[PDB]
Amino acid sequence: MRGQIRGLEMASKNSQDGISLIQTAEGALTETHAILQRVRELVVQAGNTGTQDKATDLQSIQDEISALTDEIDGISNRTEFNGKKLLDGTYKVDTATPANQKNLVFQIGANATQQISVNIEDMGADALGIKEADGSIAALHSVNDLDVTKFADNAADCADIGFDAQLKVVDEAINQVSSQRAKLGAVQNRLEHTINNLSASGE
Amino acid sequence: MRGQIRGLEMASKNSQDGISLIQTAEGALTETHAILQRVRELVVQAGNTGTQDKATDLQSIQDEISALTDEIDGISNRTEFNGKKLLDGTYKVDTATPANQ
Amino acid sequence: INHNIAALNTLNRLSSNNSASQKNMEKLSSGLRINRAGDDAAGLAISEK
Amino acid sequence: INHNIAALNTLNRLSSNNSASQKNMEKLSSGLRINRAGDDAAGLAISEK
Amino acid sequence: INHNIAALNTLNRLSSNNSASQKNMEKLSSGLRINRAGDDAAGLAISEK
Amino acid sequence: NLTAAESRIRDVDMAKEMSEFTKNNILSQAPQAMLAQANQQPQNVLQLLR
Amino acid sequence: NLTAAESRIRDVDMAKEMSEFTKNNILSQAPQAMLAQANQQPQNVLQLLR
Amino acid sequence: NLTAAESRIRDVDMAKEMSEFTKNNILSQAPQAMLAQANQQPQNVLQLLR
């Protein structure tokens, strides 16, 4: 019994550390999110203002979107929690193989197998989830931001340089943010209720 | 008489251990309970919001409900009291037979 | 007893209450019921959109 | 705790709110939404031209 | 006996209790469960980082 | 009206969350005093059973 | 939130460590009186077996 | 804007430094009472081991 009580208390510590981690990465994705809101403001405002704006003006906005870009790489990179670049999109990709996943498991029970699985995948190079960074689109309008002068060449129809690919990349990118944040918060629910069973059962 | 007194005292110990066991499993079911309250909040909130929500959004909620799900398996499993997975539903089923109770 | 005390529940209820009043602080502070957490994941992702 | 407190978020939300009400001051004061900052860079450079 | 007494255990349990209440003092005093000792070495080195 | 929709997720019934704020505060000041009583009773074991 | 992580190592459940503080104090006042009794019983060996 | 730069060295987050002010005050009222307990325990050595 003392075995189970001690191990369970230290397990409560473990779980609270998990709550800390997921809280950090979550707030990081919150910042990513609000930034991408500003990005969509700059894709509507970089609607060429139809064509009312100039390649000069859109070069200016594009400088802004590269600043915010490397800020998003900044979120996916600076999040070195205990030295873990958790929002390294590399860190936990399912990959359709066990070749390299690095499942960010947690340990809960004072007995064996009582573990949790965690999934953390975002990066500034992550956008519309075709499978991966498709090409110049579906990851790299987040990174490279085709609104330089390609977006003056056309604005509707070419499906790569025509506002619609781009705004769609922003949309699904932000939805990837949403989905992962929902996963993280789900984990936080499980850890709260988990500490409740640990603390009262252990009591 | 000393037979009955001694055996009865140790029986009091036995019964208090029983109170301990049932107290543990009970609090475990309390946690299960409150979790399922949240589940009904997520079945009303997963009323599709009528249909106002999306399959994306409900995929998110469903991720949450699978988390809470394996938490409920977590209660029915982690409750290894003296090594007894008491909330193993298997452990004491009546089964309509004495084959295994 | 002199070895365990039985108001350990009190510590757990005080801990949960710390989570509660702290939580209500966090919401009144920002003036927001939406969670930074993915808690209320659909409310989050919808409101984001 | 007695070592950290948890309404540090409150300091951050109050800081952001200082940025916000200060910002709205700066705009109402000059009577201008245009930023001295290159914030709204295209609105700036266009309006300059 | 008149040569040894058998509540020497009592001295050992009182000594351990001195370590215990002294320990809880040291933690409540600083307001810290972290040990100056490398006791909880990983909690230490992590929290340091 | 979309902003109305935005509110009805994120908006706070500040009266409500104040009520739960002080409710929780009361239930965080109370069990403290209970912990006092629990950590005060055995003193009479030491001092009056002995 | 890193500071939250910093707390969940170093932070004290002051109620808890107070409970173990007085618990240990009681178990440090008790065995003392036991040592009294042990260092008091053989006096009746000297004074009543002799 | 230079004055802004002047502030971002010398300026005080008065909320912050108030938080550390009362935090430190609490951690200066606490160890005092601990010093009481430490300077009160051996009295039972004198008075109950003896």
Numbering used by the authors:
A (entry chain W): 52 to 254
B (entry chain g): 52 to 152
C (entry chain A), D (entry chain J), E (entry chain M): 3 to 51
F (entry chain A), G (entry chain M), H (entry chain C): 255 to 304
From the manuscript:
There are three parts to the flagellar structure: the trans-membrane basal body that functions as the motor, the connecting rod and hook, and the flagellar filament that acts like a helical propeller. Our current understanding of supercoiling in bacterial flagellar filaments, referred to as polymorphic switching, is based upon the notion that protofilaments within the flagellar filament can exist in two discrete states, that differ slightly in length. The “short” state results from a protofilament having a right-handed inclination (the R-state), while the “long” state results from a protofilament having a left-handed inclination (the L-state). To reconstruct filaments at high resolution, all protofilaments must be “locked” into the same state, either L- or R-type, producing straightened filaments that lead to non-motile bacteria.
While the three L-type mutants (E115G, S285P, and S17P) have a left-handed 11-start helix, the four R-type mutants (N226Y, A233V, H84R and A39VN133H) have a right-handed 11-start helix, and the designations L and R correspond to the hand of these 11-start helices. The L-type 11-start helices are tilted left by ~ 1.7° and the R-type 11-start helices are tilted right by ~ 3.9°. Strikingly, we found those sites are not necessarily conserved among different species or participate in unique inter-subunit interactions. These include three straight mutations outside of the D1 helices: S17P, S285P (both within D0) and the double mutant A39V/N133H (within the loop region). We also detected two mutations, S17P and S285P, located in the middle of the small coiled-coil D0 domain. These two residues are not conserved in other species, and proline is not found at this position in any wildtype species. Therefore, mutation S17P or S285P in B. subtilis forces a local bend of ~ 30° in the helix axis, and this conformational change makes the D0 coiled-coil adopt an L-type form more easily. Here our high-resolution reconstructions expand our knowledge and we can now observe how mutations in D0 can cause a switching of the flagellar structure.
